[PDB]
Each structure stands twice: as C-alpha cells, then as structure tokens.
C-alpha cells in the first residue's frame, strides 16, 4: 500500500542504526542499511519517493520504496 508519495522533507540517522524520513508530513523508518545512501541521494537530488508498507500510520517502519526524478 502507498503510504506517502513526495519529496524527502528531512532524513534522520537514529541511535538504533535505523533511518527515518519524513515524506508528505508523515515519518517512516527503515532498518535496511542499503537504503541509507539511496534515501540521502533522493533527498539531496529532490526525488519523489513512494513509500510502500502494510502499516501506513506515521512512525510505521517500511522497506519498500520507489524513486522517481523531478
């Protein structure tokens, strides 16, 4: 299910080595290390990311995303 579609507002490296991103006013975190550089590059370049998760509430964890340029 598509939780959020938009430009990354901000990213945050967490104390538990997870990574949060606020997309469309909702925060989502991921335990995937592979995603950390991918999300930072998406934030910096201004990519429109689509967060897909079964749990769509803000604060929910996710793993699947789609990256599209502007």
């Amino acid at each position: 299910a598509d939780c959020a579609k938009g430009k990354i507002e901000f990213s945050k490296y967490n104390e538990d080595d997870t990574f949060t991103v606020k997309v469309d006013g909702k925060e989502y975190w991921t335990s995937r290390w592979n995603l950390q550089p991918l999300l930072q590059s998406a934030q910096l370049t201004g990519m429109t990311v689509t967060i897909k998760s079964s749990t769509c509430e803000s604060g929910s964890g996710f793993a699947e995303v789609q990256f599209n340029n502007d």
Partner: nanobody
Amino acid sequence: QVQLQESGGGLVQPGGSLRLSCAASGFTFSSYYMSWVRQAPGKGPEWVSGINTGGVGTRYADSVKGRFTISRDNAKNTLYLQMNSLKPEDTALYYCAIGEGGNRNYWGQGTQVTVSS
C-alpha cells in the same frame, strides 16, 4: 522453511500483563531486525515495536512506549513482547514479523490479545 510461532496471548483484564514470545526457525534469526505488529478488527495494521539484531536498539510506537518492552534471545531464536498495564485499546491480534513489519508475507500466524472486564 521459515517459521514464526507466536504464543503468550489470551484474555487479560485492564491493567493486567502478558508476555508474548515468538519462536523463529528456518532462517538465521540473529541476522534479522525483528518487530511486532498488531491489527485490531475494524482497524488497519499497527506497528508496535522493533529490535535490531543484537537486541540493544529498540523502537516503540507512541501508543505503547513505556508499557511494552521488546527483547530477543538470539541463542534461543525467540522474540518477546512484555505488555504491562494493558488497555482495551491494546486489543488486537499480535503478529511477530521479520524486518520492520510492513509486508504481511514476513508476519507469523498471530497470537490473540483481548483486554476486557
């Protein structure tokens, strides 16, 4: 194959306590972030708690922070959820999931929790 076996649910009175445990097999458990998700009938799935491999880095949903504690025993390939001071709002079916929840393929066949008087 990959198997997650939740246990420890039941009928609890408000303010009561429960200890959910999920016994993982068929994959090297120690290599995966684990989390707990609940889904109450009528509502959608709610992520509850998460734990990094190693068991030092725990995350909790705002609604459960302070009452719930996630832990893991990598030696016993088990994931636990200590639910203290329960509310009727905590009523749901609790799934143990590989990763951050998110994909129902990664959940187990849940354990029912029913907070009522």
